[PDB]
Amino acid sequence: DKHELGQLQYSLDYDFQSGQLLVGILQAMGLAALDLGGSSDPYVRVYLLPDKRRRYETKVHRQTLNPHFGETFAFKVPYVELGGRVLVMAVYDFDRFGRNDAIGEVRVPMSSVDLGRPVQAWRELQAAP
Numbered sequence: 001d002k003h004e005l006g007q008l009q010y011s012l013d014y015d016f017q018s019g020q021l022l023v024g025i026l027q028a029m030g031l032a033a034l035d036l037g038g039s040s041d042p043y044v045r046v047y048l049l050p051d052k053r054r055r056y057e058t059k060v061h062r063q064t065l066n067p068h069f070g071e072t073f074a075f076k077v078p079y080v081e082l083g084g085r086v087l088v089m090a091v092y093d094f095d096r097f098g099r100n101d102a103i104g105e106v107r108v109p110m111s112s113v114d115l116g117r118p119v120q121a122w123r124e125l126q127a128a129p
């Protein structure tokens, strides 16, 4: 048996008026413990490959496997140029004395998505590629 890394809720919306992709990070659930104490200090990292210098982060939530994020993030790119891009939503356990530990991620290849209407999804977290 593989255990699940965690369930993540998020939203995609293309804002045609402002010309931006809106990524909303709503919450996570049943995240994995990456501290010995049996909890984590989760935060999500969000960016739009192949561009990796434009990287956002959520606030860190001390000690919880069911964080409520509630943050929205913007990427200025035209609906047409959104093609070959993949959206990465990377959950991490903040460790103050060392590398922060990867919990898991969701990668959304933007080519495959319907974005006429807005979208709200839950996705299982997968290990890094």
Ligand SMILES: [Ca+2]
Residues within 6 Å of the ligand: 034, 035, 036, 093, 094, 095, 101
């Ligand atoms: Ca840790």
Ligand SMILES: [Ca+2]
Residues within 6 Å of the ligand: 034, 035, 040, 041, 093, 094, 095, 096
């Ligand atoms: Ca930690």
Ligand SMILES: [Ca+2]
Residues within 6 Å of the ligand: 095, 098, 099, 100, 101
């Ligand atoms: Ca660590």
